[PDB]
A = this chain, B = another copy of it.
Amino acid sequence: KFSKEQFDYSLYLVTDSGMIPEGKTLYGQVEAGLQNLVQIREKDADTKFFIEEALQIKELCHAHNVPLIINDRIDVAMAIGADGIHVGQDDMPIPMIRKLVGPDMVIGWSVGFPEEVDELSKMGPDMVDYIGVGTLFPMGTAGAIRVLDALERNNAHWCRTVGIGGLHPDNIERVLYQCVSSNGKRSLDGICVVSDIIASLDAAKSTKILRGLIDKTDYKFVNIGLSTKNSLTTTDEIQSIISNTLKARPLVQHITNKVHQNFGANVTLALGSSPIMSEIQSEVNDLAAIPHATLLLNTGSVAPPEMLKAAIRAYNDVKPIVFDPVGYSATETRLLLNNKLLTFGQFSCIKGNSSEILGLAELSNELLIQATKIVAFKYKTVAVCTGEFDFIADGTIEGKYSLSKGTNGTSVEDIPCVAVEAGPIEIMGDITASGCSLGSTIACMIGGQPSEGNLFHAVVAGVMLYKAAGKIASEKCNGSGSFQVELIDALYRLTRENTPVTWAPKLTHT
């Protein structure tokens, strides 16, 4: 026997016999990754060849102290004395299954939505002693969290969790990283690979690899210091962020809709850094390669979800993206298109206005502080919420993740959030590409940071310089038209003078 409690879901290898590399058995693979938990899925063979393959492997496994788990069948295992069974949502009811296998056998369940964890919990312990969460990629992380959360809300502590579907080395760290509860108390208990150890020409190696990622603790997703800063941003600091980004001249690639095209192009080389509006898929790897490049990502744009994914990755592969979802919560179509981009990579910063920043937090004023803080954490990013008060929460937690210990209780309630204001300036809401352009700005700051830089300040820097240059234009203008041209000026000037002690905006604490 095994005790439910000795079940280590670290790296959970689920098989699919029909996809084995030639000149290699299944026993041959499952052995390799055993030397670096295991379930069997055979939804096709003869339930006798099933029982033979299963016994042959149940013994390999017990030699390594690891248990064995079976699929759609509740006859087989029983008949071969297996350690547990894992059924999908359209397989057999969870009560019936316990009535046969009785207490003492690990029961896996596939959970995609939360109405399912509400069920899972309306059954108590000794039924569903774990679950494999939805199908991340073919819902992604965002959905993984709606679940990890219905767990806490239901205090379902007995049930563990393993992430399943789409997992690879080119995305594992990220799944493990942003797949933490909303309260930060519960993360994922493990990962399920398939086409990664099974279909591998050398499963000795690949299993080592996926181990390297799984029990590391450090997702450095961007080459900029992620340390949690509690102390407001200091004049000397904003000053050096600018001095950096000027000395640096970040190449900021703009994938964006058409209105912001010219505007943001200037707002960029006004900040004294070169811009590139390229929506060509073959370049994305050549650009992201350039010394200080930085990616501005706008939604709505005329570009296809293929090339957006190509870029989000092209940069992540080299370690800093700024993402502007506009609207991202207006129409059905925008809703999708964003959520889909949001599973492609890991973003350095998500900047949105009060509608967008509530939509992402999953639907006033204190509210907007609660909200930015969610979105900052949920997507492990510095989130920015543009308004009369720009709020700037930091949810990156230094790049830390763990298995099922979550984050040392660092909820979506207690992360560093701030406030940048200079009172009523309605006439910033009456220019186009205004928020899109706070993006180009935030973006230039982040790009100019060196390794030892700090990501939070570079954003909090950007939001000042902009709110600052925005108070000015608003004064020196006759309306909208001129407002824009005086804003681009106020930026071109504010920066070359580089004397932050001047700047309009007051920086509070949330």
Interface, chain A (partner B; CB < 8 A): 46-49, 51, 72-76, 78-79, 87-88, 90-93, 96-97, 99-100, 257-259, 261-263, 265-266, 268-270, 272, 275, 277-280, 282-283, 286-287, 300, 302, 330-334, 429-433, 477-482, 484-493
What is the CA–CA distance of A410 and B91 in the complex, to the nearest angstrom?
53
Q: Which residue of chain B is the closest to A278 with respect to CB atoms?
A: B300
The smallest beta-carbon distance between A20 and chain B, in angstroms, is 21
25 sample A-B contacts, Cβ–Cβ < 8 Å, listed by A number: A47-B87, A47-B91, A47-B92, A48-B93, A51-B92, A73-B75, A74-B75, A79-B92, A79-B96, A258-B258, A261-B262, A266-B481, A269-B430, A270-B479, A275-B432, A279-B302, A280-B333, A283-B331, A286-B333, A477-B489, A479-B490, A479-B491, A480-B488, A481-B484, A482-B488
What is the CA–CA distance of A431 and B262 in the complex, to the nearest angstrom?
10
The smallest beta-carbon distance between A80 and chain B, in angstroms, is 8
The smallest beta-carbon distance between A349 and chain B, in angstroms, is 23
Chain B residue contacts of A268, Cβ below 8 A? 432
Chain B residue contacts of A93, Cβ below 8 A? 48, 51
Q: Are B485 and A492 in contact (CB under 8 A)?
A: no
Q: Which residue of chain B is the closest to A261 with respect to CB atoms?
A: B258
Chain B residue contacts of A275, Cβ below 8 A? 432
Q: Are B479 and A47 in contact (CB under 8 A)?
A: no
Chain B residue contacts of A92, Cβ below 8 A? 47-48, 51, 75-76, 79
What is the CA–CA distance of A334 and B91 in the complex, to the nearest angstrom?
50
What is the CA–CA distance of A212 and B265 in the complex, to the nearest angstrom?
51
Q: Which residue of chain B is the closest to A485 with respect to CB atoms?
A: B481
Most buried by B among A257, A332, A481: A481
Q: Are B492 and A487 in contact (CB under 8 A)?
A: no
The smallest beta-carbon distance between A235 and chain B, in angstroms, is 23
Chain B residue contacts of A79, Cβ below 8 A? 74, 92, 96-97, 99-100
Across the interface, A492 reaches (CB within 8 A) one of B73, B96, B269, B480, namely: B480
A272-B47 contact, Cβ under 8 Å, with A92-B75, A486-B482:
no
Chain B residue contacts of A96, Cβ below 8 A? 51, 79
Across the interface, A270 reaches (CB within 8 A) one of B74, B282, B302, B480, namely: B480
Q: Are B272 and A48 in contact (CB under 8 A)?
A: no
Q: Are A277 and B262 in contact (CB under 8 A)?
A: no
Q: Which residue of chain B is the closest to A469 with respect to CB atoms?
A: B479
What is the CA–CA distance of A259 and B253 in the complex, to the nearest angstrom?
13
The smallest beta-carbon distance between A78 and chain B, in angstroms, is 6
Chain B residue contacts of A477, Cβ below 8 A? 489
Q: Are B486 and A491 in contact (CB under 8 A)?
A: no
The smallest beta-carbon distance between A229 and chain B, in angstroms, is 31
Please list the 6 inter-chain residue pairs (A to B) with the smallest Cβ-Cβ separation, ordered nearest first: A479-B489, A481-B488, A286-B331, A74-B75, A481-B485, A479-B492
Chain B residue contacts of A280, Cβ below 8 A? 300, 333
Q: Are B486 and A282 in contact (CB under 8 A)?
A: no
Most buried by B among A74, A79, A261, A432: A432
What is the CA–CA distance of A48 and B93 in the complex, to the nearest angstrom?
7
Given contacts A262-B263, A482-B486, 13 further A-B contacts (CB under 8 A): A46-B88, A46-B91, A258-B258, A258-B261, A259-B265, A268-B432, A269-B430, A302-B302, A479-B491, A480-B492, A481-B484, A481-B488, A482-B488
Chain B residue contacts of A51, Cβ below 8 A? 92-93, 96
Q: Are B431 and A269 in contact (CB under 8 A)?
A: yes
Q: Are A47 and B90 in contact (CB under 8 A)?
A: yes
What is the CA–CA distance of A100 and B429 in the complex, to the nearest angstrom?
72
Q: Are A282 and B482 in contact (CB under 8 A)?
A: no
Chain B residue contacts of A88, Cβ below 8 A? 46
What is the CA–CA distance of A430 and B78 in the complex, to the nearest angstrom?
70
Q: Are B478 and A493 in contact (CB under 8 A)?
A: yes
Chain B residue contacts of A488, Cβ below 8 A? 479-482
Chain B residue contacts of A100, Cβ below 8 A? 75, 78-79
Q: Are B75 and A47 in contact (CB under 8 A)?
A: no
The smallest beta-carbon distance between A51 and chain B, in angstroms, is 6
What is the CA–CA distance of A72 and B47 in the complex, to the nearest angstrom?
7
Q: Are A46 and B481 in contact (CB under 8 A)?
A: no
A480-B486 contact, Cβ under 8 Å, with A72-B47, A79-B96, A93-B51:
no
